[PDB]
Amino acid sequence: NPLRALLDKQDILLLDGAMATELEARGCNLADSLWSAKVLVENPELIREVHLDYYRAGAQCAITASYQATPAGFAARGLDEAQSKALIGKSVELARKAREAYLAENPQAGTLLVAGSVGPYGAYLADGSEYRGDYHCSVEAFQAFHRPRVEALLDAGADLLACETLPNFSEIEALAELLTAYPRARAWFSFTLRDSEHLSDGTPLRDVVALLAGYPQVVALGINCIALENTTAALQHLHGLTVLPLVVYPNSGQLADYLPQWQAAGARLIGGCCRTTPADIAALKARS
Numbered sequence: 001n002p003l004r005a006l007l008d009k010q011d012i013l014l015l016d017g018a019m020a021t022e023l024e025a026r027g028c029n030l031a032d033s034l035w036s037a038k039v040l041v042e043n044p045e046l047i048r049e050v051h052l053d054y055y056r057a058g059a060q061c062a063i064t065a066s067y068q069a070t071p072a073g074f075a076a077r078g079l080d081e082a083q084s085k086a087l088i089g090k091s092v093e094l095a096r097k098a099r100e101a102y103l104a105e106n107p108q109a110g111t112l113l114v115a116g117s118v119g120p121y122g123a124y125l126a127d128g129s130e131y132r133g134d135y136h137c138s139v140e141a142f143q144a145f146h147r148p149r150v151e152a153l154l155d156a157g158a159d160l161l162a163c164e165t166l167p168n169f170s171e172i173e174a175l176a177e178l179l180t181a182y183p184r185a186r187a188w189f190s191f192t193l194r195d196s197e198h199l200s201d202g203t204p205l206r207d208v209v210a211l212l213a214g215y216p217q218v219v220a221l222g223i224n225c226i227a228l229e230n231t232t233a234a235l236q237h238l239h240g241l242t243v244l245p246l247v248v249y250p251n252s253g254q255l256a257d258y259l260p261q262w263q264a265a266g267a268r269l270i271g272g273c274c275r276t277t278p279a280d281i282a283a284l285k286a287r288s
């Protein structure tokens with residue numbers, strides 16, 4: 001368990017924040033949802049710089065730029081599976097390079113992690129379906145969609161998988177099943193919500209937690225890409241269902257002002273999602 005060493009030593013583990021904000025500030029034009037294919041090729045040094053930026057701000061875990069990096073997605077750019085897996089692997093390499101750089105600068109930084117981002121099938125559909133979850137695939141189809149990215153992230157040396165922004169229960173099942181075929185893998189599963197007690201697709205959270213409790217490789221559960229004002233209620237509900245470390249990284253509003261409420265509700269992995277920047281991580285660091 002990549003988390004145990006850190007969680008044995010401190011209550012809170014800080015995540016990072018959004019990649020896009022920082023790349024745009026540095027001059028990047030992110031024209032479409034497949035922007036990672038371009039930036040990983042044309043400006044990989046800027047991605048590495050942003051990861052380094054977040055470690056400096058206090059992040060102890062970087063999330064790779066692979067949220068929309070799948071062979072399915074990247075086929076629209078003329079890339080085949082192997083080419084796509086190369087770029088997925090590269091996203092891990094750049095975060096690992098940033099970790100090497102920071103630990104050279106600050107050897108006293110403690111343990112630092114790299115989490116491979118695994119986004120939902122909805123993000124590939126690119127119709128904002130990662131928030132509705134109303135799509136239908138067989139278990140095999142979900143698993144075929146996710147498998148190459150899981151393999152590429154693990155082979156490139158991700159410490160764990162960030163299975164995130166997940167709106168669909170059947171896909172969550174397929175993904176938990178898929179991970180058992182990689183016995184060394186560890187993951188967190190983070191969800192988008194319809195309300196404080198339901199998945200985006202309508203599933204009661206008690207059912208999601210109950211399902212995932214049977215998979216030991218899932219070492220944390222939580223919420224991300226949700227409005228600030230909707231976080232605490234959701235966490236408090238999860239807090240009554242599990243004592244797995246809870247994950248929370250919401251969209252930008254102050255984000256760091258919530259740290260005591262969140263921690264009291266069992267959150268132990270805390271960062272930022274959309275429109276957050278290293279300023280949010282720096283604020284969290286100061287309040288912890």
Ligand SMILES: N[C@@H](CCS)C(=O)O
Nearest residue numbers: 063064067117165225
């Ligand atoms: N790509 C983001 C999630 C967008 S909802 C991430 O990797 O955390």
Ligand SMILES: [Zn+2]
Nearest residue numbers: 133134135136
């Ligand atoms: Zn439907």
Ligand SMILES: [Zn+2]
Nearest residue numbers: 138139140141
């Ligand atoms: Zn089937």
Ligand SMILES: [Zn+2]
Nearest residue numbers: 224225273274
């Ligand atoms: Zn988000």
